[PDB]
C-alpha cells in the first residue's frame, strides 16, 4: 500500500518552506538544490550559500527556511526505496503539499537521476556504529627452547589487528584458544547463513 513519505504529518519546517518558495526564482531554487544535494554528499558550502544569498538578495532567515525544508523533504524521500516511492505517489504527495509542478519535476530529477545511486551508496555508510576490521596479520612460531625448559617444541600464533577507527592491537594466542576462536567463527557463520535463509523466505509469506 501507499505510504506518506513525510510520515504521519508534515513537519513545520516543510510547511514554512512550501509557503516561501511559491514565487522563488527557479534559478535560485536550482542553486539551492545543488547545494543541498552536495551537502548530503558530504561537501560544505557556507561560502556558496552566502554569495548566492547576497546575489539573490535573500535574507538569512528565508535561505535557512528554504534549505531546511528541502533537506528534510529529500532526506525523507531517500529513506524510502524508489520502488516503494513510485513516481506517481511522489508527484501526487508533493502536489498535496502544493509544490509548483516545475519544482516537483526538479526534485524528481534528484530523487530519480544518477545522483540517486551515489546517495544510496553514501546512506549505507551510516550502518556501522561499531568499527569493522581494517586488516589482520599473523606469525606462527615453534619455541624449541625456553628459560624454563631445555626443549619444548610447542607452537604459538602471534596475531595483530587494526580497526577502522585507527585502533590497533597485538596479542599472542595458544593453539587451544585458536581452535576455540576458529570454531566460534565457523558456528556464527553457519547461524548467520541459516538466519538469512529463514528471514529472506518468511518475509515473503
Amino acid at each position: 500500500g501507499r505510504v506518506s513519505f513525510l510520515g504521519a504529518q508534515l513537519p513545520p519546517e516543510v510547511a514554512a518552506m512550501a509557503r516561501l518558495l511559491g514565487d522563488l526564482d527557479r534559478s535560485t531554487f536550482r542553486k539551492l538544490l545543488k547545494f543541498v544535494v552536495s551537502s548530503l554528499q558530504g561537501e560544505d558550502c557556507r561560502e556558496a550559500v552566502q554569495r548566492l544569498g547576497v546575489s539573490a538578495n535573500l535574507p538569512e532567515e528565508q535561505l535557512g527556511a528554504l534549505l531546511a525544508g528541502m533537506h528534510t523533504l529529500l532526506q525523507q524521500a531517500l529513506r524510502l526505496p524508489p520502488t516503494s516511492l513510485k513516481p506517481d505517489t511522489f508527484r501526487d504527495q508533493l502536489q498535496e503539499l502544493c509544490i509548483p509542478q516545475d519544482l516537483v519535476g526538479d526534485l524528481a530529477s534528484v530523487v530519480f537521476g544518477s545522483q540517486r545511486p551515489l546517495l544510496d551508496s553514501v546512506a549505507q555508510q551510516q550502518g556501522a556504529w561499531l568499527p569493522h576490521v581494517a586488516d589482520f596479520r599473523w606469525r606462527v612460531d615453534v619455541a624449541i627452547s625456553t628459560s624454563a625448559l631445555a626443549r619444548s617444541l610447542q607452537p604459538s600464533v602471534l596475531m595483530q589487528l587494526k580497526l577502522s577507527d585507527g585502533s590497533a592491537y597485538r596479542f599472542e594466542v595458544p593453539t587451544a584458544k585458536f581452535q576455540e576462536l576458529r570454531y566460534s567463527v565457523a558456528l556464527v557463520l553457519k547461524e548467520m547463513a541459516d538466519l538469512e535463509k529463514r528471514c529472506e523466505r518468511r518475509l515473503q509469506d
Binding site: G7, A8, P11, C199, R202, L203, D205
Partner: protein, 199 residues
C-alpha cells in the same frame, strides 16, 4: 531442537541411575544452587564419602547435571523435548520427572544469570537538564543568549559515567523530532512483520 548429549555427557549422567532417587534430588538441589552460588567441592567430598564413592565420580556427576541444567535453560527446550532427552539418556521415569521438575522450576532464573555473559555495550541510564540564560561576560556586559544545559548519564561494564553537553532550542526540537521518529519506526508494518513472523 533436541539436546543430544555428548558421549562424555552421557557417561557423566550414567552415574546418577545408581544413586537413590532422594539423593539424585539432593544432587539436583545442590546443582541448581551451584548455578547461582557457585560450586563447593566439600559437597562432592561429603556426598561421595556418604555414598562410599570416589569424589571424582560425584564431582563429574554433579557438574554434568549442572551442564544439563545450563544447556536446557539456554535452549528453552519444551517439556516433551526435555523428556525425550532424558529418555534417550535412559533415565527412569522417577528421575525423568525429577529432572523435568528441576528444569521447569529454575530455567528462567538460570537465564537471568546467563544473560550477563553477553558482551558489554554502553547504554543509557538517565538524563538531567537545565534551562539557563547568559546575561553578561567580561568583554560584553549586557546580552541575552539562551541555551539548554544537559548532563547525560551512561554506564558500561556496570560502571558509572557522565557527559556534560549544551544545545540551542532549535537543535533540541530537531533532537525531539528525530527520536520521536525512531519510536514511530517500531509501529510501522515491516518491523511488526519481523517481530511476529521471525519469532
Amino acid at each position: 531442537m533436541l539436546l543430544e548429549l555428548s558421549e562424555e555427557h552421557k557417561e557423566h549422567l550414567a552415574f546418577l541411575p545408581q544413586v537413590d532417587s532422594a539423593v539424585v534430588a539432593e544432587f539436583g538441589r545442590i546443582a541448581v544452587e551451584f548455578l547461582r552460588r557457585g560450586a563447593n567441592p566439600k559437597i562432592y567430598e561429603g556426598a561421595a564419602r556418604k555414598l562410599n564413592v570416589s569424589s571424582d565420580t560425584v564431582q563429574h556427576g554433579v557438574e554434568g547435571l549442572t551442564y544439563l541444567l545450563t544447556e536446557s535453560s539456554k535452549l528453552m527446550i519444551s517439556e516433551l523435548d526435555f523428556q525425550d532427552s532424558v529418555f534417550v539418556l535412559g533415565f527412569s521415569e522417577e528421575l525423568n520427572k525429577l529432572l523435568l521438575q528441576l528444569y521447569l522450576d529454575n530455567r528462567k532464573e538460570i537465564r537471568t544469570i546467563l544473560s550477563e555473559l553477553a558482551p558489554s555495550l554502553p547504554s543509557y541510564h538517565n538524563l538531567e537538564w537545565r534551562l539557563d540564560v547568559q546575561l553578561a561576560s567580561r568583554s560584553l556586559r549586557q546580552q541575552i543568549k539562551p541555551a539548554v544545559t544537559i548532563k547525560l548519564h551512561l554506564n558500561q561494564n556496570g560502571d558509572h559515567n557522565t557527559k556534560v553537553l549544551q544545545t540551542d532550542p532549535a537543535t533540541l526540537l530537531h533532537l525531539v523530532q528525530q527520536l520521536e521518529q525512531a519510536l514511530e519506526e517500531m509501529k510501522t508494518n515491516h518491523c511488526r512483520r519481523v517481530v511476529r513472523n521471525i519469532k
